[PDB]
């Protein structure tokens with residue numbers, strides 16, 4: 001019934017009781033664990049998700065059962081009855097947004113869950129206006145390098161009609177251009193998205209860090225191409241504290257990590273375009289983005305500059321180079337005065353967050369494989385921490401690509 | 404598509420469906436409501452388990468349905484009916500032991516499953532004879548440095564009769580002495596067992612690396628204490644290819660990783676004392692044993708020698724040091740010409756193992772968090788491989804400490 005969660009470093013032990021407020025099923029069954037997969041494959045249902053969410057809200061501001069709580073429940077019943085749907089009040093939205101981040105099992109930065117700038121964008125009618133909002137969000141979130149976490153929430157989905165979508169997977173993304181030789185200049189992860197921009201009229205550059213434009217989609221209309229004003233997009237050239245040759249690799253990364261393809265579910269309403277951003281954890285860039293074989297895959301290159309022995313694996317040239325790369329990122333950011341958090345600091349404050357959430361809620365859904373960073377795993381306290389994963393609502397979801 | 408778990412590799416973009424999981428006759432800890440994937444520990448019934456394994460045996464020799472097959476079946480239910488247990492034929496045992504290693508979701512060494520040496524010790528009747536048996540195992544398996552995989556199978560559980568048990572978790576372990584100061588000299592993992600040996604008559608050593616004696620338990624007797632002749636316990640003094648001072652730390656490790664407290668379950672029958680052994684992956688010693696906060700914890704020590712800034716996380720001092728320590732392990736094992744495998748090579752052969760298993764059985768149960776190494780996760784290909792975990796049989800199980 002209630003599972004026992006141990007830390008193998010300290011011998012400490014908790015019991016997750018939060019996991020009973022899970023109303024949504026995951027992929028595992030008693031017969032096989034599938035917890036390592038990246039993805040899945042009526043008035044009544046909405047009304048109870050809403051009732052539950054409203055109760056969560058009035059609880060969150062300790063007014064459960066009071067006057068405004070009663071009339072608000074009746075307001076919702078009344079609106080669903082007559083229309084098959086309802087709408088959120090600004091504050092209610094702001095609550096749900098904070099809560100869906102709080103509930104995200106794969107986010108290691110949740111210590112921050114309470115500090116979130118919310119832009120109400122539900123009064124959007126054109127892709128033009130989407131672009132305007134997307135630009136104010138960026139200017140806000142970037143703040144000359146002192147990064148502030150943000151979300152912008154575009155109009156909810158509606159059964160009569162198509163969705164507001166941002167086709168881009170991230171507001172800021174580097175193009176991936178497919179060469180004659182069947183190789184890739186730029187980011188391999190963004191090949192298909194770079195192809196769409198082009199087909200919808202974009203003139204492409206041909207460097208390895210060409211910021212893609214945005215494809216914005218208003219209901220039931222063709223998507224529209226908007227170029228991001230280059231001064232909004234704060235980038236960081238990568239140099240290395242001791243290695244003078246590093247900078248000449250002309251490596252660089254963008255400051256703002258802002259996901260833009262996930263759906264935000266609150267009280268069983270759905271928000272198909274609701275981009276969110278915080279700040280990077282170094283490993284995201286130094287390890288995944290630059291060292292993944294199916295990304296920029298710079299490991300061999302760097303290591304050769306370091307003059308390490310590539311011939312065998314036991315000289316540990318991959319690990320050696322991986323470290324200098326993450327190192328380079330941290331220095332470069334810290335030097336350009338842009339918010340960055342290394343994997344040690346981040347995981348330490350996630351242990352803290354686990355402890356906060358323990359006393360506050362009786363648990364914390366967490367996805368161990370995603371919370372443990374991609375280098376130096378066991379070197380970080382989270383490695384040694386048993387974790388329970390489950391789905392609480394409000395939530396972010398994956399949704400299908402609009403095309 | 405197919406109605407079995409679909410299994411993606413994200414570096415390569417390749418897909419497989421796991422049909423092997425259908426063969427799983429036993430629940431693990433996950434449910435649709437919550438994933439417990441990351442948790443470390445979780446007469447009538449006999450006959451059908453036995454029937455199952457006999458069916459497996461006959462499959463493996465291509466004889467499903469035949470006179471010998473069905474006679475063996477008749478033979479087994481005769482024995483159970485008459486006495487409540489039954490006994491394995493020699494080759495049946497060899498098959499099952501190899502099948503339990505093949506079936507183990509948390510071992511990355513499984514590409515070698517077919518090449519294991521099975522020592523039958525079901526005739527053993529004393530703790531002296533147990534000791535002898537263990538000595539031969541260590542001898543054979545150590546093979547002067549050219550390591551050979553082995554298991555020594557002692558007699559099974561009996562209805563109302565005491566188990567054959569090895570009290571030590573591993574055949575070779577270093578002492579852990581609790582200090583009046585609060586600290587621990589030696590390996591803190593081994594505090595209890597060290598204390599259980601002194602209590603049973605061992606005269607303790609003084610060191611960070613004192614090899615423990617064996618507590619061996621014949622059925623229904625107190626455990627007897629046996630000291631391994633030093634010449635049998637092959638150890639590797641640690642040193643660094645280039646950092647000359649490392650050899651001065653006086654760190655060392657033993658060659659033979661030999662688990663000894665696991666239960667081996669074949670077709671219903673339970674072998675409570677059936678120690679097995681292989682060769683190390685570099686990271687077991689260099690990253691867990693030596694760098695864990697709750698073990699030798701030598702990360703700080705080493706970083707000071709390398710002269711890193713240990714006053715801030717973002718110097719990645721832990722990362723740097725851990726890489727040199729892992730490197731020190733490989734160089735030192737290579738130098739002493741003792742078998743070892745680094746995390747890269749190992750993870751590569753596990754991908755090949757996965758490919759093989761797909762073709763042979765249609766899947767491979769795999770505990771992702773456990774397969775992926777404790778440094779350089781995403782640098783090894785297993786990190787990009789989705790894994791299904793489920794329990795097949797023959798199996799190795801954890802089992803309660805005998806005391």
Ligand code: HEM
Nearest residue numbers: 101104106107108109112149150276277278279280281396
């Ligand atoms: C504020 C600083 C933040 C840090 C340091 C951080 C860190 C991370 C990291 C390391 C991941 C793993 C992602 C990957 O490797 O692709 C992640 C995922 C995630 N984070 Fe954050 N995060 C931050 C802010 C936020 C904010 C503001 C939100 C929402 C408003 C958020 C919600 C999420 C979600 C929903 C995921 C899941 C990605 C997925 O399922 O694919 N995080 N975060």
Ligand code: HEM
Nearest residue numbers: 504507509510511512515552553679680681682683684799
């Ligand atoms: C041949 C060389 C082998 C290598 C390189 C290897 C590698 C590993 C590694 C790295 C682990 C994880 C250990 C940890 O960090 O706690 C492991 C676990 C395991 N291995 Fe192996 N293995 C080898 C041979 C064997 C053999 C001969 C057996 C038995 C026949 C075996 C059975 C197991 C089992 C049952 C586990 C799970 C331990 C647990 O559940 O705590 N392996 N293996």
Ligand SMILES: Cc1cc(N)nc(C[C@H]2CNC[C@H]2OCCNCC(F)(F)[C@H]2CCCCN2)c1
Nearest residue numbers: 169257258259261276277278279280281284398
């Ligand atoms: C808000 C926030 C802060 C932060 N530091 N980091 C993040 C994750 C970002 C950064 N670094 C990767 C990206 O994460 C994007 C979410 N995951 C992407 C994916 F891998 F799942 C694929 C497959 C299916 C869905 C689409 N893309 C978010």
Ligand SMILES: Cc1cc(N)nc(C[C@H]2CNC[C@H]2OCCNCC(F)(F)[C@H]2CCCCN2)c1
Nearest residue numbers: 512572660661662679680681682683684687801
């Ligand atoms: C046969 C073989 C080959 C190899 N390379 N490596 C091994 C694992 C050994 C060595 N290095 C770790 C140890 O694995 C032993 C089992 N690990 C789990 C544990 F240590 F946490 C505890 C708690 C649960 C109960 C059991 N023991 C075996």
Ligand SMILES: C[C@H](O)[C@H](O)[C@H]1CNc2nc(N)[nH]c(=O)c2N1
Nearest residue numbers: 036038369370371786787788789
């Ligand atoms: C298949 C596996 O689950 C996948 O490669 C995961 C592993 N852990 C991860 N962890 C984080 N933080 N981000 C990721 O994208 C992944 N990818």
Ligand SMILES: C[C@H](O)[C@H](O)[C@H]1CNc2nc(N)[nH]c(=O)c2N1
Nearest residue numbers: 383384385386441442443772773
């Ligand atoms: C807490 C977490 O489940 C635990 O620390 C696991 C993670 N992966 C592991 N993987 C291996 N090979 N060995 C281990 O001991 C662990 N420990």
Ligand SMILES: [Zn+2]
Nearest residue numbers: 028033433438
């Ligand atoms: Zn699971």
